[PDB]
Write a protein that binds this ligand. Structure first.
Ligand code: BCL
Ligand code: BCL
Ligand SMILES: CC[C@H]1c2cc3[nH]c4c(c3C)C(=O)[C@H](C(=O)OC)c4c3nc(cc4[nH]c(cc(n2)[C@@H]1C)c(C(C)=O)c4C)[C@@H](C)[C@@H]3CCC(=O)OC/C=C(\C)CCC[C@H](C)CCC[C@H](C)CCCC(C)C
Ligand SMILES: COC1=C(OC)C(=O)C(C/C=C(\C)CC/C=C(\C)CC/C=C(\C)CC/C=C(\C)CC/C=C(\C)CC/C=C(\C)CC/C=C(\C)CC/C=C(\C)CC/C=C(\C)CCC=C(C)C)=C(C)C1=O
Ligand SMILES: COC1=C(OC)C(=O)C(C/C=C(\C)CC/C=C(\C)CC/C=C(\C)CC/C=C(\C)CC/C=C(\C)CC/C=C(\C)CC/C=C(\C)CC/C=C(\C)CC/C=C(\C)CCC=C(C)C)=C(C)C1=O
Ligand SMILES: CCCCCCCCCCCCCCCCCC(=O)OC[C@H](COP(=O)(O)OCCN)OC(=O)CCCCCCCCCCCCCCCCC
Ligand SMILES: CCCCCCCCCCCCCCCCCC(=O)OC[C@H](COP(=O)(O)OCCN)OC(=O)CCCCCCCCCCCCCCCCC
Ligand SMILES: COC(C)(C)C/C=C/C(C)=C/C=C/C(C)=C/C=C/C(C)=C/C=C/C=C(C)/C=C/C=C(/C)CC/C=C(/C)CCC=C(C)C
Ligand SMILES: COC(C)(C)C/C=C/C(C)=C/C=C/C(C)=C/C=C/C(C)=C/C=C/C=C(C)/C=C\C=C(\C)CC/C=C(\C)CCC=C(C)C
Ligand SMILES: COC(C)(C)C/C=C/C(C)=C/C=C/C(C)=C/C=C/C(C)=C/C=C/C=C(C)\C=C/C=C(/C)CC/C=C(/C)CCC=C(C)C
Ligand SMILES: COC(C)(C)C/C=C/C(C)=C/C=C/C(C)=C/C=C/C(C)=C/C=C\C=C(C)/C=C\C=C(\C)CC/C=C(\C)CCC=C(C)C
Ligand SMILES: COC(C)(C)C/C=C/C(C)=C/C=C/C(C)=C\C=C\C(C)=C\C=C\C=C(C)\C=C\C=C(\C)CC/C=C(/C)CCC=C(C)C
Ligand SMILES: [Fe+3]
Lengths: 250, 305, 53, 275, 81, 44, 53, 44, 53, 44, 53, 44, 53, 44
């Protein structure tokens, strides 16, 4: 097929490349609409439907079946977020930040925002609780690196809030996910391993002040943790990265 | 701040032997070792493997192809273990010369051994493809891995099976040396004008770059939202948490549009798969349809003059 | 005869968008076919007919 | 138009330079101080590209090319029609790329999350800056930068590649290619595995992350894990960028012959030198 | 004081605040700019000590006569070669 | 009463009649165009 | 005969869309084959027949 | 005249910092535009 | 006319930011275009006028 | 009473008046500059 | 006619921004197209007319 | 009396009238410019 | 006839946006086609017609 | 009133007067620089 052309200089190669462009436009349409199964329809800044919705219409509903008798999930769901957010707009126009109306960390807004997940523990493939204290797992042991248990924990101001007393591990993926802190405040606390640095003398948490440690979102039980509790704890620390940054030295 | 790049403390319990969802357990080995130098980066368990009919057959055919390439090297070294080691990268098992066309009648040390080895290499990759399919089927999973592997195999087969047949000569297939197949790539671009002016070579590069860039972006995104239960990507697909939301809002605020937890993997799947799919198309058209991509670009208005 | 009931199975929105896109692309390609042929390129044909229009 | 969960994340704070002066959104886009600078740099560079195109003979967007100054200008500022437009665009490009990363930092600070994304993009920026700044400065002429054009910068890639014979024989180039190929393979496998678990065979419940560990352990004997695959993809892509930049930096600065002759250290080892 | 100035002093406190702020902005910009210029000048200086064959590489860009904006239609940077 | 689409039967009837009217208009215009083009430059 | 039961096994939406796509592509390739062959290229044939039409 | 009301919409601290940045950037544009012209470069 | 009602539609903070960005960008572009033309580059014109200024 | 920005009609009028004074000053300077440049080197 | 009812469909802010962007890009492109053509490049024309202005 | 934008019918009318005045002013300036350009360098 | 019921099926916002974009793109394509053809490029035509306008 | 910055009317006037003092000082120094350069190497 060399030198033999359709249409007067339109080749099998020209045909192939134009065919690819057509297919790729269709694939971009497909990919974009697949990626619209969360967060749509667009809202306005008062919780009502937005005037504009974009060139791409929403995809057809798709269902996920969940193992271990945890029902079905269909998306896009067209539902609005199932939590109230203690903000208030700073301008009558659009495109400007909304300001917290109370304590941003206690209310759960901004970088401290939590999503309303189900109040049940995430499960492993065998239907057991996926993240548990090692007192429950009981076959897990420290394999390498330094064990943080017994070390003092130091907040983002250089003050010690307590000691590491327990690790919470993921039994499916063999990982430590939380450090249980016993507080001199008087109670206990879970700290995400992703937010703690273990050193020889202490575990240092550079996101949360010592006063913040007095109010960390609690868990109902000390043998399992729900996805909602996980969201609240991790959101509290990630929000501290903004709302506690002034307590740092200097 | 802890960058989730390396694990701080490793932990280990009973070794995990796998899910049982229709896998023939007697084809799954039983021995795992736990290697902590890997546990700094990823999992420490060197787990069991599954070994059934397809895997055994694929390994036999591939190992025999490997062996035959090695034997050819030994023979062309004139038996010298010194030349064999000195030329481990510079030697190749080359296809038959052009005068033999597509016939199976070329001397054993001038393409015949190349043909035999190529046949067994063909057999093993197809059996490995069937393996990728059947391991998914035995667990009840979708077939995305096998489809993605089919795209890469398509580039492989246009390289040495489809295009040499359409050109009428085994002599255009790629040799089995480390340095000689790079020489083959350079020669291929040089004989077909310049392969930069091949639009499907351009599109293949775009998807290679984009797949590298996309997985820089996605790995960085997941690591950045790891403070939240971020890398548990499954279960964020069905129960959206703040990790998925903040990941979406980062890219929405940055570039004006975002993906979803499930859908970023479709983008990556398609960008990765389209690299060999589009590349194979461009090689197939080279020589068969276009002889000189430079003059073709000049005629099609994207090379000057 | 009774082809209408297809609208009970195929959603008219997708059908109409698909038909519009296909019809436009087909028309574009037929015109480009004719323009690339120097026997049906009306611009150059008129240039010749009217002595450089 | 906000996503149905977006409102609770649109709070003040996280900025680096100008406080609440630019702390607002335009549609989806966060602006901030570096959004102003990135928009200005991007607009000025695009608009100088268009102006340079106007001074040529084609409006075909595949033939437009802005060329670096000739070598005789060295590292000086060239007359604006003799390479100066290229230098203006290059400075605008650096300004916009750096502003884009700083804007990404501010968005990460507002949504309190790690800074991995601007870090990775900075690796991409470093590859670009190696191409247009670092290497031409060491060689002593801006004209060793690559011309800006959809298909003419490929002429640059070609000419520089064939200056050192076949560029394949560049060990850092080999390392970079392997990292590009491997990151593409890893993206394919990771996307495929996620999709297979989320989209099972018809009628089956959704698969668990145990099933996907099991799938790779069955297929290859090893599973890096969910956290591990993202660390791996990130570092693979970053290393590909860095070793590509080292590849090109070495050529013409510390190595000058055909790259094939570099391996003569192995081929001329004295025991098998003469064989 | 829920205002960065309240009493203000109306001519001197405001003037010092404004001088401090504008000088801070200009000074950080000056630091960044001169650091970058110094880095480039250092790279050029170092390149002066590379082997002489670092100055043998030919011009790597192709001039296509349709992008040649020098003033003359020749396909090259005129007045040099 | 299977409705993949939610239309009632008579809604499908009206929709089909309107669609057919539009189709026939388009086809008639194309027919006239082809006759004009064939007179101007015949291609069979 | 009794073939209607195939519509109990194959979803008509998928089958109809697939068949439409396949028929269109087949027709396009057959026309392109005819155009590429300079013995059935009707535009050039008519150009020759009417002396440049 | 009433231009002082600009400070009712834009906070003066931030504007002062931003203006320092902008003025230095404008200066560097002008200086190296001058360096680009052979007849106005003062280094040599 | 009564164009003042633009300020019931567009907020002044963002409008002023966008206006400043656009106006500075346009001024820089026009000056650059004049510098690139060898009939309106004032530095070289003055070079010629005074015999090297 | 349509108001997106939150202003009242009076504040919009006052803001527009000041804005127009700024714009007219800028345009007057630009006009003077263009007249000077046209005398120096006419471009039409 | 009664086109005002467009404002019942589209938000004025989005439409005005889109219109401004469109008009700016259109005006830029037309001027650049004129300047690239040496029949409507006013700078060079004035250079010729006034003997190097 | 429903609308996508939330504007009342009266608000849309005054909006449209002001917008039309603006468009007409823009167009009249463009028309004068085109007459000037056509007298100077006719393109038809 | 009674085509109006299309607005009962297709959302006006998307349709109007798509129509505007498509019409502008089509008009641009046709103008560029005419400018690319040196028999309908009106700038050079005028240049020849008025003897270097 | 229309106060985004939280200043009062009187604070804005005073800060504007200070800003004007600083800006005229900057412009006067710039004028001296331009006179020196123009004497040295005139660009018009
Ligand atoms: C002088 C050299 C030429 C050139 C000549 C070629 C040629 C020739 C080809 C490419 C191809 C490619 N080129 Mg090149 N190319 C050049 C310049 C470049 C530049 C550059 C910056 O200059 C870049 C980035 C690229 C990039 C690329 C890739 C996008 C593309 C391969 C895609 C792919 O999937 O590969 C990786 C994937 C594969 C190789 C598929 C096969 C792998 C199989 C599946 C492996 C299976 C297992 C195996 C059998 C056994 C071992 C396993 C056991 C465990 C041990 N080219 C210049 C112009 N290029 C290819 C292409 O697609 O072109 C259109 C191709 O054939
Ligand atoms: C004759 C040609 C030579 C050759 C000569 C060269 C030369 C010369 C070079 C390479 C380089 C590379 N080559 Mg090689 N190469 C050849 C053959 C190959 C083959 C092959 C299969 O044959 C392959 C796979 C490769 C592969 C590669 C990569 C390792 C590398 C390019 C990646 C890179 O730099 O990313 C780096 C990424 C970037 C620079 C991108 C930066 C992006 C910036 C930050 C953002 C831009 C945004 C944009 C303006 C925005 C637009 C806005 C829109 C809204 C989107 N080469 C042959 C043998 N190759 C290059 C390299 O290593 O460069 C460092 C290089 O210079
Ligand atoms: C989307 C496109 C990308 C991609 C996709 C892809 N590749 C894939 C997959 C996918 C989705 C798989 O599922 C499959 C896989 O299983 O991956 C883990 C595979 C895979 N891609 C691979 C490689 C690969 N992919 C490449 C490319 C890419 N693959 C693309 C970039 C490349 C490149 C860039 O060149 C390579 C080299 C493999 C890891 C794997 C396929 C496994 C396979 O082919 O097995 C066949 C087996 C053999 C040839 C047997 C070899 C046996 C040993 C030599 C035995 C040694 C014995 C002893 C040392 C002695 C030997 C000699 C004698 C004495 C015996
Ligand atoms: C799990 O997480 C993940 C997601 O999320 C859940 C994701 O989304 C993504 C993101 C990835 C995707 C959505 C997939 C598709 C992305 C790509 C293929 C990457 C390539 C993208 C482009 C083609 C880039 C184009 C976008 C750009 C550059 C935006 C351009 C915008 C401007 C130039 C102007 C910006 C506007 C500003 C600053 C306004 C300023 C206002 C003033 C007045 C000043 C990733 C990685 C992810 O892993
Ligand atoms: C051939 O030679 C030449 C070179 O090469 C050697 C050059 O490189 C260059 C110079 C190079 C460039 C032009 C590109 C690189 C330029 C820089 C490094 C400087 C970068 C400039 C900026 C980023 C400034 C951008 C400023 C903007 C967008 C204006 C901001 C305006 C607002 C935000 C709105 C108004 C402000 C507000 C909100 C408050 C109101 C203000 C009050 C005073 C009150 C030139 C000219 C040259 O010719
Ligand atoms: C001066 C010229 C300017 C252009 C020339 C530059 C080259 C362009 C080539 C690549 C195109 C990059 C342009 C990307 C546009 C960025 C703006 C953007 O995408 O955001 C706007 C839009 C709105 O977002 P949203 O409202 O959320 O959409 C869903 C609601 N219905 O968001 C969306 O549209 C969502 C759809 C996402 C679009 C998908 C992106 C595709 C990128 C894949 C390219 C890879 C292959 C490229 C091949 C290159 C070959 C050379
Ligand atoms: C340039 C001249 C026009 C800008 C001057 C005035 C800008 C004022 C600041 C601003 O942009 O306002 C934000 C604008 C309006 O959004 P506001 O968020 O409306 O409230 C939503 C109510 N539904 O936010 C937006 O919604 C902006 C987007 C409006 C619709 C834009 C349509 C696409 C934009 C042009 C197409 C893309 C091309 C971009 C540039 C291409 C360059 C090659
Ligand atoms: C193509 O390239 C080139 C660049 C050739 C041509 C480009 C031309 C262009 C586009 C040029 C753009 C020029 C512009 C937009 C210039 C804008 C200049 C401005 C607004 C300058 C304002 C300066 C204001 C200052 C310095 C204010 C200082 C205020 C203070 C409070 C400082 C405090 C200190 C004192 C002493 C205050 C005085 C107080 C008392 C009591 C005396
Ligand atoms: C030959 O090359 C060709 C290729 C050049 C390239 C392109 C050719 C083509 C296709 C050109 C097509 C051009 C088009 C589509 C042009 C259309 C232009 C339009 C629609 C211009 C409209 C301008 C409208 C303006 C300026 C409107 C209003 C301005 C105002 C100031 C009104 C203010 C509005 C207010 C105050 C509303 C507030 C009211 C209330 C009640 C709050
Ligand atoms: C100590 O024992 C031994 C002897 C181990 C020492 C061994 C040394 C060894 C094993 C050396 C091996 C070295 C190398 C360099 C192996 C790798 C070579 C490369 C770069 C391979 C890349 C190949 C690329 C492609 C596209 C290969 C094949 C593609 C196909 C489609 C295969 C099918 C093609 C044909 C012609 C099948 C023929 C079928 C019939 C019926 C004739
Ligand atoms: C390119 O050259 C060669 C010759 C290579 C190859 C030729 C290839 C082939 C196969 C060409 C023919 C392809 C086909 C299948 C053509 C058939 C087209 C058909 C069946 C069109 C059917 C109906 C046409 C219209 C225009 C339908 C409805 C009326 C409208 C006004 C369109 C928009 C309205 C829609 C979509 C529904 C709502 C109804 C109204 C009235 C608004
Ligand atoms: C070759 O030709 C090329 C290619 C150049 C293409 C041509 C492109 C062009 C020229 C495109 C268009 C340019 C356009 C359409 C417009 C420019 C408009 C301008 C110059 C607007 C300038 C306005 C200046 C102003 C408003 C100055 C304001 C200063 C002030 C102090 C105003 C203070 C305002 C207020 C509201 C104070 C606050 C009051 C209260 C009560 C809060
Ligand atoms: Fe992932």
């Amino acid at each position: 097929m060399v030198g033999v052309n359709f249409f007067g200089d339109f080749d099998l190669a020209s045909l192939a490349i134009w065919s690819f462009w057509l297919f790729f436009a269709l694939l971009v349409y497909y990919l974009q609409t697949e990626n619209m199964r969360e967060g749509y329809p667009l809202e306005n800044e008062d919780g009502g439907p937005a005037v504009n919705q974009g060139p791409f219409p929403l995809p057809s509903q798709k269902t996920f079946k969940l193992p271990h008798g945890r029902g079905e999930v269909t998306v896009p769901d067209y539902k609005k977020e199932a939590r109230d957010v203690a903000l208030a707009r700073t301008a009558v126009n659009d495109g400007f930040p909304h300001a917290p109306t109370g304590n941003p960390m206690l209310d759960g807004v901004g970088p401290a925002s939590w999503a309303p997940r189900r109040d049940i523990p995430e499960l492993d493939g065998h239907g057991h609780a996926k993240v548990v204290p090692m007192s429950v797992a009981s076959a897990f042991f420290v394999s390498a690196g330094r064990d943080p248990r017994g070390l003092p924990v130091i907040a983002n101001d250089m003050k010690t809030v307590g000691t590491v007393t327990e690790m919470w591990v993921d039994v499916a993926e063999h990982m430590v996910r939380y450090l249980e802190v016993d507080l001199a405040s008087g109670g206990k606390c879970l700290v995400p391993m992703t937010m703690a640095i273990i050193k020889k003398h202490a575990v240092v948490v550079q996101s949360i002040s010592s006063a913040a440690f007095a109010s960390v979102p609690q868990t109902k039980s000390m043998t399992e943790i729900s996805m909602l509790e996980e969201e609240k704890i991790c959101a509290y620390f990630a929000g501290g990265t903004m709302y506690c940054a002034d307590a740092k030295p200097k | 701040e802890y960058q989730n790049i390396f694990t701080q403390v490793q932990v280990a319990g009973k070794p995990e032997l796998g899910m049982v969802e229709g896998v023939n357990l007697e084809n799954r080995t039983t021995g795992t070792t736990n290697w902590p130098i890997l546990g700094w980066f990823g999992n420490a368990q060197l787990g069991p493997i599954y070994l059934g009919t397809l895997g055994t057959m694929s390994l036999i055919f591939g190992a025999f192809w490997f062996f035959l390439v090695g034997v050819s090297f030994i023979i062309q070294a004139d038996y010298s273990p010194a030349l064999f080691l000195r030329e481990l990268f510079r030697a190749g098992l080359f296809p038959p010369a052009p005068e033999y066309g597509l016939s199976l009648s070329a001397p054993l040390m001038e393409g015949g051994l190349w043909l035999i080895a190529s046949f067994f290499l063909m057999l093993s990759v197809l059996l490995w493809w069937a393996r990728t399919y059947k391991r998914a089927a035995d667990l009840g999973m979708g077939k995305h891995t096998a489809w993605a592997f089919a795209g890469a195999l398509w580039l492989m087969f246009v390289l040495s099976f489809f295009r040499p047949i359409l050109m009428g000569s085994w002599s255009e297939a790629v040799p089995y040396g480390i340095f000689p197949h790079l020489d083959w790539t350079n020669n291929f671009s040089l004989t077909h004008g310049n392969l930069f002016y091949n639009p499907f070579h351009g599109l293949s590069i775009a998807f290679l770059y984009g797949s590298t860039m996309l997985f820089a972006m996605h790995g960085a995104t997941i690591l950045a939202v790891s403070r939240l239960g971020g890398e548990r990507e499954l279960e964020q697909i069905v129960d959206r948490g703040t990790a998925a939301e903040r990941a979406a809002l980062f890219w929405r605020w940055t570039m004006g549009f975002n993906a979803t937890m499930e859908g970023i993997h479709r983008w990556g799947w398609w960008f990765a798969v389209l690299t060999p799919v589009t590349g194979g198309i461009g090689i197939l058209l080279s020589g068969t349809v276009v002889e000189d991509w430079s003059v073709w670009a000049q005629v099609h208005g994207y090379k000057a003059l | 005869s009774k082809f209408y009931k297809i609208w009970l199975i195929f959603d008219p929105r997708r059908v109409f968008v698909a038909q519009g896109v296909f019809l436009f692309l087909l028309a574009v390609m037929i015109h480009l076919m004719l323009l690339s042929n120097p026997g049906f390129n009306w611009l150059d044909i008129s240039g010749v007919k009217y002595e450089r229009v | 138009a906000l996503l149905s969960f977006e409102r609770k994340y649109r709070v003040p704070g996280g900025t680096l330079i100008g406080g609440n002066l630019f702390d607002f959104w335009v549609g989806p886009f966060y602006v901030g101080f570096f959004g102003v600078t990135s928009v200005f740099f991007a607009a000025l560079g695009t608009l100088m590209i268009l102006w340079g195109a106007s001074l040529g003979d084609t409006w075909n967007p595949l033939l437009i090319s802005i060329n670096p100054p000739p070598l005789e200008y060295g590292l000086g500022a060239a007359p604006l029609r003799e390479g100066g437009i290229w230098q203006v665009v290059t400075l605008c490009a650096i300004g916009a790329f750096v502003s884009w990363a700083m804007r990404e930092v501010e968005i990460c600070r507002k949504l309190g999350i790690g800074l991995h994304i601007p870090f990775a993009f900075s690796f991409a920026i470093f590859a670009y800056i190696t191409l247009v700044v670092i290497r031409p400065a060491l060689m002593g002429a801006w004209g060793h930068g690559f011309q800006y054009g959809v298909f003419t910068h490929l002429e640059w890639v070609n000419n520089v590649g064939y200056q050192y014979g076949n560029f394949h024989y560049n060990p850092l180039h080999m390392l970079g290619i392997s990292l590009f190929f491997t990151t593409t393979l890893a993206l394919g496998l990771h996307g495929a595995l996620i999709l297979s678990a989320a989209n099972p065979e018809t009628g089956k419940e959704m698969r668990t992350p145990d099933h996907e560990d099991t799938f790779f352990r069955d297929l290859v004997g090893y599973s890096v894990g969910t956290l591990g695959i993202h660390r791996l993809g990130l570092l693979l892509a970053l290393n590909a960028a860095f070793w590509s930049a080292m590849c090109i930096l070495a050529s013409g600065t510390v190595w000058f012959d055909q790259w094939v002759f570099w391996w003569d250290w192995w081929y001329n080892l004295p025991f098998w030198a003469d064989l | 004081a829920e205002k960065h100035y309240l009493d203000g002093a109306t001519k001197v406190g405001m003037a010092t605040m404004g001088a401090a702020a504008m000088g801070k902005g200009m000074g950080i910009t000056a630091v960044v700019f001169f650091g970058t210029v110094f880095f480039v000048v250092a790279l050029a200086f170092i390149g002066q000590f590379l082997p002489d064959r670092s100055r043998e590489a030919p011009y790597p860009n192709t001039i296509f006569q349709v992008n040649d904006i020098d003033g003359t239609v020749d396909g090259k940077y005129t007045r040099f070669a | 009463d299977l409705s993949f689409t939610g239309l009632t039967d008579q809604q499908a009837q009206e929709l089909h009649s309107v669609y057919l009217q539009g189709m026939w208009l388009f086809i008639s215009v194309a027919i006239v165009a082809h006759l004009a083009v064939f007179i101007w430059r015949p291609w069979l």
